[PDB]
Amino acid sequence: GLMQFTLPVRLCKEIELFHFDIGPFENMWPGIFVYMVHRSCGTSCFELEKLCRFIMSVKKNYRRVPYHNWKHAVTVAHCMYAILQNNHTLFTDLERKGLLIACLCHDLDHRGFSNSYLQKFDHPLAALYSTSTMEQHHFSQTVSILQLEGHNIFSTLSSSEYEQVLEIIRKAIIATDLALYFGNRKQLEEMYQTGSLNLNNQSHRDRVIGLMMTACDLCSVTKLWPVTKLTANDIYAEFWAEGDEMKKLGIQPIPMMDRDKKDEVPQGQLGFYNAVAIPCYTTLTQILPPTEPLLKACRDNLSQWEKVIRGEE
Ligand SMILES: COc1c(C)cnc(CSc2nc3ccc4ncccc4c3[nH]2)c1C
Ligand SMILES: [Mg+2]
Ligand SMILES: [Zn+2]
């Protein structure tokens, strides 16, 4: 009960900032997550014995893929922590409990392949879940881990609070399907501009939570330039392995996944920042003004990718 996690001074300070990198020491990541839960939620939100056993089971069910790994889970959870901390009063006790857990779990048992590759391969998951294939799997795996003996971190919630939190996590994880982001943001953009956006409207909260999940999932583009650049190597390492597997099925991959078209990475990063990243953090900043540092970091990284093209790096 009286057992806090404490971090070294530099981590204690930097963890509060949006651009924090969780570092290369894997054994510290569980403590960093527990720390974020305690400060975001309370030392009482979860039984520490059960949380610690949940965290270690979730870690075990992430695979050794270049990008969609345990480090990504904790990175995405930290970005959600930074959003929740800078927006204290806008979120309920259940939402703060649910969203950190959702982020940690959002990519459980990822194999390093897109929903498209699963469909073209005719993977069994593509028969079980026709849309948002991996995201439905990620939620399935989250529920399975919650049902292991001694892993139910939500046991002290009423039957209805339990159903509400599982429904927050499910929508949260489905929302990380980027195919769903474009529509969700257009709708949020229209509602904000015509003044109809209402945070007591549950269907509106869902949309806002969806956008927070996309913002946290993409937070690679909001770090300091060297973190951003080095994470892009991991992202492409997965994409180019998928492109290799497309070629093996006799299908030309899209250029993003073709290692033969490495040279076009800088131009492709420009399209992505302009088409996805900047619009994402712009709509989020309009809805939650204290998330502006993410939009500012994202614009800085757009400018760095423009310098790569112009041969200055
Ligand atoms: C996970 O989301 C991302 C993040 C965070 C960062 N960077 C990316 C990659 S964006 C991207 N879009 C394109 C389009 C064409 C390309 N042609 C050749 C080489 C790279 C390309 C590319 N990269 C994603 C998808
Ligand atoms: Mg995912
Ligand atoms: Zn993710």
Question: Tokens representing 213?
Answer: 């999940």
CA of 220 to the centre of ligand 3 (A): 10
Torsion, CA 185, CA 186, CA 192, CA 195, rounded to 10 = -150
3-state secondary structure of 308: helix
CA angle in degrees (0–180, nearest 5) for 17-13-281: 0
Q: Ligand 1 pocket by C-beta < 6 Å: which residues? A: 218, 220-221, 232, 235, 255-256, 261, 264-265, 268-269, 271-272
The environment of the single-atom ion ligand 2, i.e. residues with CB closer than 5 A, is 107, 176
Question: Tokens representing 161?
Answer: 């609070």
Which of 265, 278, 294, 302 should be mutated for ligand 1, with most atoms under 8 A from CB?
265
Spot the catalytic one: 68, 110, 137, 151.
68
Which residue has the CA at smallest separation from atom 22 of ligand 1?
268
Contacts of the segment 137-141: beta carbons below 8 A, 24+ positions apart: 137/108, 137/109, 138/105, 138/106, 138/107, 138/108, 138/109, 138/110, 138/173, 138/176, 139/105, 139/169, 139/170, 139/173, 139/174, 141/61, 141/105, 141/108, 141/109
Yes or no: say if 197 and 235 are a contact pair by the CB < 8 Å rule. no
Question: Tokens representing 151?
Answer: 């892993």
Burial of residue 188 (number of CB atoms within 10 Å: 0-12, 13-18, 19+): buried
Instruction: Give Dmax over CA atoms of the chain in angstroms.
Output: 60
Torsion, CA 139, CA 145, CA 147, CA 153, rounded to 10 = -100
Exposure of 178 in the CB half-sphere (CA atoms within 13 A): 13
Q: Give Cβ neighbours of residue 28 (< 8 Å, ≥ 6 apart).
A: 22
Residue 68 annotated in ligand binding = yes
Going by C-alpha positions, the residue among 170, 96, 97 that lies closest to residue 135 is: 170
Yes or no: say if 26 and 70 are a contact pair by the CB < 8 Å rule. yes
CA angle in degrees (0–180, nearest 5) for 133-139-145: 135
Which residue has the CA at smallest separation from atom 11 of ligand 1?
268
Question: Tokens representing 131?
Answer: 């849309």
Q: What is the resolution of this structure in A?
A: 2.2
Question: Tokens representing 92?
Answer: 């309920």
Residue 244 annotated in ligand binding = no
Active site residue 68: yes
Question: Tokens representing 57?
Answer: 């089971």
Sole residue written with tokens 């989020």: 284
CA of 81 to the centre of ligand 1 (A): 26
d(CA 26, CA 148): 24
Pure H helices in 122-224: 124-128, 133-146, 159-174, 178-193, 202-217
Q: Give Cβ neighbours of residue 297 (< 8 Å, ≥ 6 apart).
A: 18, 19, 221, 222, 223, 224
CA of 23 to the centre of ligand 1 (A): 24
d(CA 61, CA 40): 25
Domains and CATH numbers, the chain: 28-310 (1.10.1300.10)
d(CA 169, CA 313): 41
Which residue has the CA at smallest separation from atom 16 of ligand 1?
256
Q: Give Cβ neighbours of residue 157 (< 8 Å, ≥ 6 apart).
A: 94, 165
Amino acid type, 250: G
CA of 36 to the centre of ligand 1 (A): 30
DSSP code of residue 287? H
